[PDB]
Every structure is written in structure tokens, then in C-alpha cells.
Symmetry: D2
Subunit: 117 residues, 4 copies
């Protein structure tokens, strides 16, 4: 019975209209007692550009999170230069009962993100 993470992502390569497979993503959360980023998990996107199992319901607490997408390495492996060596998306979770989809739609020279559910 497959466990469903409340935080999901999707990487789409908009230049060829295909998923962003095999991109390294690192999730962090700011520690409020110190003021430092704590690493939570590191994953590699699957062939559908997604990264299931980012975090459990119990660990998904209110806080500030950072997702780092290794875009420079992603494009390097495709044999291409990228304008952005990495992409960090920093976001505030206050409502913990909701699903948060935090995707990266990217080309070599542009990207976008949105909050969804």
C-alpha cells in the first residue's frame, strides 16, 4: 500500500517537451533554533521527471524549505551549457494538511516554478 509524500515536484524540460530525468534534487529545511539549513534528503528525478517520497507526513512540519535542483549538472550530462548553474526554490509551509507541488519547468536559458496541490 504505497506511501504518499505531501511534498512533490516535477521537472520538465520545456526546450524538448520531455521530462527532466535524472536531475539531482536536494531538500533542506531551515533549523529555527540555530539559523542553518538542515539537509533532509537527496534524490534523483525518475524518467517521468518526478521524485516520489521526498518527506513523510510526520516530518513535514511548518517551516522554511529549500529545494536545490542541479541544473548545471543536468544540462552538462546532456552535453549543453546552462545559464543557471543550479536553481534553489525557497518556500514557506504553514498549512500542513495540504499537498504542495513545487515543480521546475526549465530550458537552458529560462525557468519557472508555481505552487500547486
Amino acid at each position: 500500500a504505497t506511501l504518499l509524500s505531501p511534498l512533490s515536484t516535477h521537472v520538465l524540460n520545456i526546450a524538448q517537451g520531455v521530462p527532466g530525468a535524472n536531475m539531482t534534487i536536494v531538500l533542506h529545511r531551515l533549523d529555527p533554533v540555530s539559523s542553518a539549513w538542515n539537509i533532509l534528503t537527496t534524490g534523483i528525478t525518475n524518467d517521468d521527471g518526478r521524485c516520489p517520497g521526498l518527506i513523510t507526513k510526520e516530518n513535514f512540519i511548518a517551516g522554511v524549505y529549500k529545494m536545490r535542483f542541479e541544473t548545471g549538472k543536468y544540462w552538462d550530462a546532456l552535453g549543453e551549457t546552462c545559464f543557471y548553474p543550479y536553481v534553489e526554490i525557497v518556500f514557506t509551509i504553514t498549512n500542513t494538511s495540504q499537498h504542495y507541488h513545487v515543480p521546475l519547468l526549465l530550458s537552458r536559458f529560462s525557468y519557472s516554478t508555481t505552487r500547486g496541490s
Copy 2:
């Protein structure tokens, strides 16, 4: 004439993003420290002139931090992103680079322009 420019557009309201704080940094490639080059605030056209001089514009990895949560809160609204940082590599130093931020409360995009 800054070789690096920006423009902030509030896509929720279709107006320039005025008075947003933007800090430009340059990476120390040998350590991995970020150095602050310029701190500015966008004007009523959403622009930030004089981000850097021609003479200080060398190849390297630069970051612009845009103070998005502070911008939205001043307008009476929350933002999903406490700040946005765009990190980009400069190799060819004779080109102009336009690095804009197009944002709502819950989205943002950027593109490399000239």
C-alpha cells in the same frame, strides 16, 4: 551603463514590481563564499540601474537575491517564497545580460535576455 540589468513584473496585477530590494553577489570560486557587489531597490518602472560597472563585470558566477516576501508583505499579502535567488554564469563579458523576475504570490519565472 550597467552590463547587467533586471526588471521585476508583478504578473498578478500587471504592473512593475516597485520598491523591491535586490542584492547582487559574486561567488568566490576558490572558497565557496558569496560576495555582495551591490544592494539596490527597484524604481517605479521595476528597474534597478547601476547594478555593476563595466570594469567590475568579469566572468564568474553571480546571484541576484530578490526580496519577494518583503515586497508582498508591504503590499498586505503573503508570498509563498520568502526570497527568490537567481544564480547565473557570465562567460562572455561584452554582452549585455538582462535577468528579470516575473512573479505572483505563488509563482515566478526568469529568462536570460540581452
Copy 3:
């Protein structure tokens, strides 16, 4: 259903619920648009059953999103009275996701699977 969509209201970070979407196919001889389906997005901003797998033939399609009516029911104006995305389908074995991410003064779309 090999064609799917998703409407995101990126001003509020919520699904774009109750938006009318009309799907057409171009008559490749006359240049007429033939209506295929008229739907309304659900609470999750999706429109299931846009086309059936049998009826999904190659050619040029248009999805029309009634954006001006969507914002109007929300008590707001939209720069765009409607949005039409026109695309060419050459391979009918694939899934095509044709979404609309919109605010009152912007929008974007992406070919997805």
C-alpha cells in the same frame, strides 16, 4: 483519454475550478473548426474525458479556455477574454497534457505527458 489538461490559478496558488474549456479539431480541407467537446474543470482544475482514445486522430487541435468568464465569476477582470492554444498532434500513441497556468495578466503553457 490521451489529452488532459490542468488549470492553475497562479495568483492564488489554487486549481482553476469551474472554467469552461472547449476542444475543437481543424477540418484539414475547409479551414473550419469542428467542436469535439465542451467541459468545465472540476475542483482540482482538471477536465477528464476531453476526447476519447478512438476519436483522438492526428491533426491540429484548439483548446479554448474561457478565462474572462472564469475571472468574472471570481469578481475580477482579465486582460484576456479567452485563451486559445492551438497545437499539432502527429503521434497519437502519446499522452498530451495541455495545461494553462494563469493570472489576470499573464499565462503560460507547456507540452507535457
Copy 4:
């Protein structure tokens, strides 16, 4: 002294990070009596992906306009396909005193637009 069109555009090719040069653009306005699109101007973008003189101050009245971008043609002269054979942005003008910038930021498999000033 230069006459500036109240309606401007900019086409940006976001897969290469260059201006979308030599893109055909056709501006229409909805006819008040027939319910038909009337062609106003046809142009080709310049080397900076822009099209000065889309319309005169005097022709720019309250209305519903459509900007058509020949994206299929544009990509084809670069030797590639596009998912969209053309792109039309239909927009309402009520306030005739403001400047309107209606850009197109395009890859072969994505595009975006915004209302600007």
C-alpha cells in the same frame, strides 16, 4: 521626434536565450458589426525580436485585439518543429492612455505572455 506605437511586443526564444528575430506578426481587431477579425498590420520582428510601429495612436481605440505570431514558420526556418503552428493572444483594450507591451517568450514546446507597461 520619434513616434512610438502604444502597443509593443518582444519575442524571445528561450531555448537559445536569443531574440526571436524575423518572426511574422499580424495584428487584428474585432470588427464591431461583423463579428470578424480585421487585419490591421503585418510585420516581421527585427534582430532584437521587436516590432516598432504596430499601430498608430489614432488607430489604437478601445477594442478586442488579437496578436498572431507565426511560430510554426519561425521554428521551421531554423530547421525545427514547433508544438504550436501559430500562437494568438487575444486581449481587451479599454484604457487607451496606457502603454501595452504584449510579449511572446517561446520554446518549441512552451510559451508564455504577460501584460506589460
